[PDB]
Amino acid sequence: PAPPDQKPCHQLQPAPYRALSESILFGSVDEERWWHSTAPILSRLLISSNYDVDVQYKYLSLYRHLVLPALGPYPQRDPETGIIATQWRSGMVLTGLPIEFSNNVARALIRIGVDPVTADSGTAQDPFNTTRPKVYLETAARLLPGVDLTRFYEFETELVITKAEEAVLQANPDLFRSPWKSQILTAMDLQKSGTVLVKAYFYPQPKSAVTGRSTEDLLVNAIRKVDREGRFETQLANLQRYIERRRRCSFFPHFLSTDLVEPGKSRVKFYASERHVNLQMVEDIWTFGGLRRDPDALRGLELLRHFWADIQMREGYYTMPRGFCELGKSSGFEAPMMFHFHLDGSQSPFPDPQMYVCVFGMNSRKLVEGLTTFYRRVGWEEMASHYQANFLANYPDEDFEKAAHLCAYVSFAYKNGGAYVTLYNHSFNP
Amino acid sequence: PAPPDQKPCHQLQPAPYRALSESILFGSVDEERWWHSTAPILSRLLISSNYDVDVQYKYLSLYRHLVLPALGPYPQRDPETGIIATQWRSGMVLTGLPIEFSNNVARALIRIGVDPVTADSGTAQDPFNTTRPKVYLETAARLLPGVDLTRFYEFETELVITKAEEAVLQANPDLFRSPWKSQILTAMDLQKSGTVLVKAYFYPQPKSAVTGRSTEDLLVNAIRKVDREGRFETQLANLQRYIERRRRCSFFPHFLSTDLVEPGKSRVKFYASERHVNLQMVEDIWTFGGLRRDPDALRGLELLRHFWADIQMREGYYTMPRGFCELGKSSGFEAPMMFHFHLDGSQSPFPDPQMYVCVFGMNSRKLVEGLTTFYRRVGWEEMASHYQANFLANYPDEDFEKAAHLCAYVSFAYKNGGAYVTLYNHSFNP
Ligand SMILES: [Cl-]
Ligand SMILES: [Cl-]
Ligand SMILES: [Cl-]
Ligand SMILES: [Cl-]
Ligand SMILES: [Cl-]
Ligand SMILES: [Cl-]
Ligand SMILES: [Cl-]
Ligand SMILES: [Cl-]
């Protein structure tokens, strides 16, 4: 596993962002303000991760053309409270913003997470944001080669509410009281070659409310129905058997995601949240109750233990987040830990697990110091030396003694004898 | 005078053009087809002229955002004749296309000439294209720093028809029978630093038709009225005295152009067409009847003589162009020679002349061979070696035994002890 690139880039206006900024005519004030609040962070991420210049420009232009209009209204500041939020509170970030850039610091790859929204999203005209995500994926599909939507349609049919089911949730608003209303989210994985890999995420909590089927049964029946070839059947069965063991409760099946490629090559990730945030519970999940203890499983768990200590995670029993914690809102915010399970079409009996720890509310500078300690432990030299100062460079006017919102989640997997660490960070500067 | 850069670039899809092409969503089919027919030529021009990568992207993006929508309907092919034209026939090129990229091969600088048009331009809704150029310059002005429109307004008021005068030309179409209907044209000079210098050109032949004032009196009264400080007064007077000498006819005042900067720093170029295309007439104009024979004037004229022979220009008496010669139309096309006079605000008694020879209808490959001979004569080594193959690389599928439309005009001046040569070339690939 070749160590990740990390070049320094602290510049407040990186050259590609300026070059485009001085050339773009925006047909919307919102698109213009979004750009100036996020494009500098994207541009820095791209040059620090050592993407080629041509590819930097491809992606900043794509950001401009495809993403900006899908971000909807620019966030607004409350005069007296100072809190800055958008009317639709996205399930993608705890700040509720519809945009997030994530940094795979094991490979130096950037991903753009987008909750496609309109001015009507959240309001009476569209209270569950049904159509705009689809339109976004459809547009991405015609623009971007290799983007195959067959998996999205199959899951949309099973996992997203129909127009009648909406009416039931409008007529009777007591049946779905959660403010987390996002059904679909998107992600574009930006490869070094210029190719974009698109993923869709499905959150069927509203379909659950209207049909009386639990989130688990929806996810599993969905996956099981779409899986014609039965490539996921073994891993899925054993994940179910594990969720069964756990129910006989703190483990909660939450959502899934799928890639958008040829069906017989497609791969799904099943997400579950866990509220006992402690290292004995991580082992239980990581090893499926001690059933999955091959060398690779245990070697990864030893390293997971090192990671957990290095970033200084606190143990605890943490309940699902009450509302949101938007910019201006104060965080020491505590939330649940999370796992995805990778249904990969291999012959492995168990799908590969990936841990997501919510670090939102932990001092972000401190957290990144702990990560640096971890980068050194695994010999990621360039990243050890340069990442922290690139991290802080994205939040120029911010106070890092108080700031605990800059990193929201960190994920850990073990792939090819190596740690895989991804930071999900604050992607917005007013 | 430091010799011009010229790097080779023969690639059919240069990297910046691909990078943008794979990222742009076009809200118009016309903008999309325009882009694919012209952006490769612009991208090649920019890398051969050795512009920085960031600046290449600034300008290709600007092309995309500001220019593409101003090009109006994509040109259409006639099934039986094969001729390819746009409904509005632009006065900017003999092909009638609203776009032209010109190459200053003395400095390696590119300029974008644009005739801003809509789907309505030329038709009953807008037969003289009055508003769209203004809108373009106004948009460029808010986008681009340093663009000052005070000069444009002053000349627009004097030189472009009012809405009543239009009505007179519609009601009575016999009063203006010329198909050259463009009143305003634009040019963006792309500097190496990233700064864009915008010029406006004014063609008052229609205002002439409705007011009964000759083109000359319009141009001179216009310049004279706008010139508060009297910076142009001496050069203008002597140019008039010369036009007077010539009338007492083949010399014809045609149009002017102005830069768009601070007024007291502004500079105008007065254009006139000459139909005795021969070297004795060039001397007469160049030296204002033998009144302007300082060493710089005569040293430039010696070099002009070399240029004229090297590109193998044919002498002759040539009358103004009857209609257009569009793509698919056959050229050995003969047209008038042309001169501009640079009213520069200096203390010189005479404004600097610049010759424009119409080479449209001369074999373009042959012409560029003759230019290469000229580049060598003046020691422009890189340009001598690489320009021809960069020229031909812009017209990939074309036959260069017949092709005489690829270069339309070539201009010659003498600035700072050195030749200044600019090619005005075909900027479109179907
Ligand atoms: Cl590079
Ligand atoms: Cl429906
Ligand atoms: Cl149902
Ligand atoms: Cl803390
Ligand atoms: Cl460069
Ligand atoms: Cl008017
Ligand atoms: Cl008048
Ligand atoms: Cl010839």
Side-chain angles (χ1 to χ4, degrees), chain A residues 1-76 78-79 81-86 88-124 126-162 164-174 176-180 182-228 230-247 249-261 263-264 266-298 300-313 315-321 323-328 330-430, chain B residues 1-76 78-79 81-86 88-124 126-162 164-174 176-180 182-228 230-247 249-261 263-264 266-298 300-313 315-321 323-328 330-430:
Chain A
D5 291 341
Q6 195 67 187
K7 312 289 169 179
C9 177
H10 312 310
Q11 301 161 105
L12 222 157
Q13 284 173 172
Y17 154 77
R18 287 196 284 100
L20 288 162
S21 287
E22 301 166 354
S23 73
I24 298 162
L25 285 169
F26 296 90
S28 166
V29 188
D30 290 317
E31 291 185 21
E32 191 173 16
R33 298 175 168 170
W34 279 120
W35 168 263
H36 290 298
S37 282
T38 65
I41 296 170
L42 180 50
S43 186
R44 293 190 212 95
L45 290 163
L46 294 176
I47 106 80
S48 57
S49 302
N50 201 29
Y51 283 88
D52 297 340
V53 182
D54 291 333
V55 178
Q56 294 173 33
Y57 279 106
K58 186 189 185 173
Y59 295 155
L60 286 164
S61 180
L62 188 66
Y63 188 65
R64 185 270 176 278
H65 284 89
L66 177 58
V67 178
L68 294 189
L71 298 189
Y74 192 71
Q76 302 184 173
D78 186 320
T81 72
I83 143 174
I84 301 182
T86 53
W88 171 264
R89 268 138 251 255
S90 186
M92 196 166 60
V93 222
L94 289 165
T95 45
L97 298 187
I99 183 68
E100 178 184 69
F101 312 119
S102 68
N103 198 335
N104 179 340
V105 288
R107 305 289 291 113
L109 301 174
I110 297 305
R111 169 211 231 101
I112 310 173
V114 177
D115 186 352
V117 293
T118 66
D120 282 330
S121 302
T123 70
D126 192 2
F128 278 94
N129 199 37
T130 34
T131 44
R132 188 60 179 95
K134 177 162 73 185
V135 171
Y136 181 92
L137 288 170
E138 288 184 332
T139 297
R142 300 186 302 266
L143 179 55
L144 298 172
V147 170
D148 191 350
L149 288 165
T150 160
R151 242 42 166 169
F152 166 82
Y153 290 127
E154 288 183 305
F155 283 121
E156 158 220 71
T157 292
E158 303 306 293
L159 297 181
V160 179
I161 62 191
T162 72
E165 292 166 320
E166 272 192 28
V168 171
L169 297 179
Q170 303 207 240
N172 189 12
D174 221 66
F176 186 86
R177 265 278 150 72
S178 202
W180 293 11
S182 291
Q183 289 174 109
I184 301 156
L185 299 172
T186 65
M188 288 190 293
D189 288 307
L190 312 177
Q191 292 183 67
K192 247 64 195 235
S193 72
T195 305
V196 180
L197 265 13
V198 192
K199 318 287 185 55
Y201 293 68
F202 290 88
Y203 289 81
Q205 284 66 51
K207 191 88 166 203
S208 189
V210 300
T211 57
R213 293 203 291 281
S214 66
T215 295
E216 181 190 335
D217 286 339
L218 285 169
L219 294 168
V220 169
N221 299 343
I223 294 163
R224 188 100 74 210
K225 184 202 262 193
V226 184
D227 192 20
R228 270 193 165 106
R231 277 192 307 122
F232 313 130
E233 174 55 42
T234 280
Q235 287 175 358
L236 185 61
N238 292 332
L239 175 53
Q240 272 177 289
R241 288 178 186 110
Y242 179 70
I243 292 164
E244 191 93 321
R245 204 188 75 103
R246 291 297 310 279
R247 102 191 337 127
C249 184
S250 45
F251 199 64
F252 284 103
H254 202 331
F255 58 97
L256 60 70
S257 80
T258 177
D259 55 7
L260 300 164
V261 303
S266 257
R267 296 187 301 186
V268 175
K269 292 174 173 155
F270 186 103
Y271 298 76
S273 84
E274 174 64 54
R275 32 217 294 192
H276 283 294
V277 171
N278 63 61
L279 267 176
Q280 276 59 37
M281 193 62 84
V282 177
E283 162 166 7
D284 194 87
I285 302 167
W286 197 269
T287 72
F288 294 76
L291 287 179
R292 186 195 165 255
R293 298 180 60 81
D294 57 281
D296 214 275
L298 301 178
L301 180 49
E302 88 100 62
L303 196 69
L304 194 160
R305 283 169 187 144
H306 281 304
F307 173 84
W308 180 280
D310 282 348
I311 65 167
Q312 301 192 60
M313 268 266 56
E315 280 99 53
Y317 184 69
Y318 300 138
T319 129
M320 276 85 65
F324 287 94
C325 198
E326 311 94 336
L327 284 80
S330 199
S331 308
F333 186 93
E334 66 200 28
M337 156 177 81
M338 185 180 302
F339 282 84
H340 87 220
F341 303 87
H342 189 20
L343 309 180
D344 66 359
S346 67
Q347 293 298 296
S348 246
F350 298 88
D352 284 339
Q354 180 155 303
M355 182 186 69
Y356 301 70
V357 289
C358 178
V359 291
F360 196 94
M362 302 178 65
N363 196 261
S364 296
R365 185 211 272 156
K366 192 193 176 83
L367 190 102
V368 173
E369 287 162 13
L371 292 167
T372 292
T373 295
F374 184 79
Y375 302 157
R376 295 219 180 82
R377 177 189 296 287
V378 294
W380 296 340
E381 191 210 75
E382 269 212 301
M383 192 69 80
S385 281
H386 301 116
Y387 182 80
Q388 196 179 142
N390 288 333
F391 185 76
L392 299 172
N394 292 321
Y395 316 110
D397 298 297
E398 197 94 60
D399 177 76
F400 304 114
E401 181 251 50
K402 226 267 195 188
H405 57 97
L406 304 181
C407 190
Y409 282 80
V410 187
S411 71
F412 182 100
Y414 199 76
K415 291 185 180 192
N416 252 282
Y420 264 62
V421 173
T422 301
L423 303 221
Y424 290 81
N425 302 328
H426 192 46
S427 305
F428 178 85
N429 279 299
Chain B
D5 291 341
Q6 195 67 187
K7 312 289 169 179
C9 177
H10 312 310
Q11 301 161 105
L12 222 157
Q13 284 173 172
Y17 154 77
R18 287 196 284 100
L20 288 162
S21 287
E22 301 166 354
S23 73
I24 298 162
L25 285 169
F26 296 90
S28 166
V29 188
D30 290 317
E31 291 185 21
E32 191 173 16
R33 298 175 168 170
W34 279 120
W35 168 263
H36 290 298
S37 282
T38 65
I41 296 170
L42 180 50
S43 186
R44 293 190 212 95
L45 290 163
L46 294 176
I47 106 80
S48 57
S49 302
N50 201 29
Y51 283 88
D52 297 340
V53 182
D54 291 333
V55 178
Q56 294 173 33
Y57 279 106
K58 186 189 185 173
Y59 295 155
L60 286 164
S61 180
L62 188 66
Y63 188 65
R64 185 270 176 278
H65 284 89
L66 177 58
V67 178
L68 294 189
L71 298 189
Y74 192 71
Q76 302 184 173
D78 186 320
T81 72
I83 143 174
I84 301 182
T86 53
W88 171 264
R89 268 138 251 255
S90 186
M92 196 166 60
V93 222
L94 289 165
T95 45
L97 298 187
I99 183 68
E100 178 184 69
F101 312 119
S102 68
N103 198 335
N104 179 340
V105 288
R107 305 289 291 113
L109 301 174
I110 297 305
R111 169 211 231 101
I112 310 173
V114 177
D115 186 352
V117 293
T118 66
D120 282 330
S121 302
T123 70
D126 192 2
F128 278 94
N129 199 37
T130 34
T131 44
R132 188 60 179 95
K134 177 162 73 185
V135 171
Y136 181 92
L137 288 170
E138 288 184 332
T139 297
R142 300 186 302 266
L143 179 55
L144 298 172
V147 170
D148 191 350
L149 288 165
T150 160
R151 242 42 166 169
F152 166 82
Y153 290 127
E154 288 183 305
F155 283 121
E156 158 220 71
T157 292
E158 303 306 293
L159 297 181
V160 179
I161 62 191
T162 72
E165 292 166 320
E166 272 192 28
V168 171
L169 297 179
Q170 303 207 240
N172 189 12
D174 221 66
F176 186 86
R177 265 278 150 72
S178 202
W180 293 11
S182 291
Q183 289 174 109
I184 301 156
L185 299 172
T186 65
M188 288 190 293
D189 288 307
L190 312 177
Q191 292 183 67
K192 247 64 195 235
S193 72
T195 305
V196 180
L197 265 13
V198 192
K199 318 287 185 55
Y201 293 68
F202 290 88
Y203 289 81
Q205 284 66 51
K207 191 88 166 203
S208 189
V210 300
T211 57
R213 293 203 291 281
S214 66
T215 295
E216 181 190 335
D217 286 339
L218 285 169
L219 294 168
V220 169
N221 299 343
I223 294 163
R224 188 100 74 210
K225 184 202 262 193
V226 184
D227 192 20
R228 270 193 165 106
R231 277 192 307 122
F232 313 130
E233 174 55 42
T234 280
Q235 287 175 358
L236 185 61
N238 292 332
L239 175 53
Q240 272 177 289
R241 288 178 186 110
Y242 179 70
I243 292 164
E244 191 93 321
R245 204 188 75 103
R246 291 297 310 279
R247 102 191 337 127
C249 184
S250 45
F251 199 64
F252 284 103
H254 202 331
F255 58 97
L256 60 70
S257 80
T258 177
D259 55 7
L260 300 164
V261 303
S266 257
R267 296 187 301 186
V268 175
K269 292 174 173 155
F270 186 103
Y271 298 76
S273 84
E274 174 64 54
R275 32 217 294 192
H276 283 294
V277 171
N278 63 61
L279 267 176
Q280 276 59 37
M281 193 62 84
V282 177
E283 162 166 7
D284 194 87
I285 302 167
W286 197 269
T287 72
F288 294 76
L291 287 179
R292 186 195 165 255
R293 298 180 60 81
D294 57 281
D296 214 275
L298 301 178
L301 180 49
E302 88 100 62
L303 196 69
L304 194 160
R305 283 169 187 144
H306 281 304
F307 173 84
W308 180 280
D310 282 348
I311 65 167
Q312 301 192 60
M313 268 266 56
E315 280 99 53
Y317 184 69
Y318 300 138
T319 129
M320 276 85 65
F324 287 94
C325 198
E326 311 94 336
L327 284 80
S330 199
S331 308
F333 186 93
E334 66 200 28
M337 156 177 81
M338 185 180 302
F339 282 84
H340 87 220
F341 303 87
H342 189 20
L343 309 180
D344 66 359
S346 67
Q347 293 298 296
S348 246
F350 298 88
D352 284 339
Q354 180 155 303
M355 182 186 69
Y356 301 70
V357 289
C358 178
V359 291
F360 196 94
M362 302 178 65
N363 196 261
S364 296
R365 185 211 272 156
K366 192 193 176 83
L367 190 102
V368 173
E369 287 162 13
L371 292 167
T372 292
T373 295
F374 184 79
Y375 302 157
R376 295 219 180 82
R377 177 189 296 287
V378 294
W380 296 340
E381 191 210 75
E382 269 212 301
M383 192 69 80
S385 281
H386 301 116
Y387 182 80
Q388 196 179 142
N390 288 333
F391 185 76
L392 299 172
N394 292 321
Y395 316 110
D397 298 297
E398 197 94 60
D399 177 76
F400 304 114
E401 181 251 50
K402 226 267 195 188
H405 57 97
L406 304 181
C407 190
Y409 282 80
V410 187
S411 71
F412 182 100
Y414 199 76
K415 291 185 180 192
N416 252 282
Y420 264 62
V421 173
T422 301
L423 303 221
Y424 290 81
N425 302 328
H426 192 46
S427 305
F428 178 85
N429 279 299

